[PDB]
């Protein structure tokens, strides 16, 4: 699956953030509230399993990782939903004022500006810490999608408080914390 692409588990749709690697093996990271629901993930609702969960953390954080088990070696890119893709080649933390994009499977690519970093967000399940607030529009099914700027991976889509027009509220989990948690790098 490419970054921003749909993934299905537990009868729900989420989105993948980025393809990552360690030890010559391929994995994708996504939202923890998505990997909490299921161990097996497919690229269509009743499709064959492409990967199995190897870790998850939600609430407190919101990230998780799925190991590919179907023998594929996907490109390390994010789907721009227009026939093309964005190559990702590094990861960093977002900064206030930075223009970002997110790609997820419900609203495809939307854009916004980072308004705050290191934010605690209270969801119904509990608080998630050290989050990033943006003005990018989003909707259910977009969690786990890629927050990025050019070839730089910045975050994993977690949630929002709504959107009207272009004025969104997409919140992301910093991707660097998930990459260190699992000892993985983007490629």
């Amino acid at each position: 699956v490419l970054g921003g692409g749909a993934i299905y588990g537990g009868g729900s749709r989420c989105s993948a953030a980025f393809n990552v690697t360690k030890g010559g093996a391929r994995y994708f990271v996504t939202a923890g509230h998505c990997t909490n629901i299921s161990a097996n993930w497919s690229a269509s609702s009743g499709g064959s399993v492409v990967g199995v969960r190897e870790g998850t953390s939600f609430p407190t954080n919101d990230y998780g990782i799925v190991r590919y088990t179907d023998g594929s070696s996907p490109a390390g890119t994010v789907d721009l939903y227009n026939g093309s893709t964005q190559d990702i080649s590094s990861a960093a933390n977002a900064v206030v004022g930075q223009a970002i994009k997110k790609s997820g499977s419900t609203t495809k690519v939307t854009s916004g500006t980072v308004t705050a970093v290191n934010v605690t967000v209270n969801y119904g399940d509990g608080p998630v810490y050290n989050m990033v607030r943006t003005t990018a529009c989003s909707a259910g099914g977009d969690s786990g999608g890629a927050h990025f700027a050019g070839s730089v991976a910045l975050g994993i889509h977690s949630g929002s408080s709504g959107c009207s027009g272009t004025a969104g509220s997409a919140i992301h989990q910093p991707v660097t914390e998930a990459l260190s948690a699992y000892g993985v790098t983007v490629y």
């Binding site: 969801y123 909707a139 977009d142 977690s158």
Partner: peptide
């Protein structure tokens, strides 16, 4: 805010 809600998870999406």
């Amino acid at each position: 805010a809600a998870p999406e």
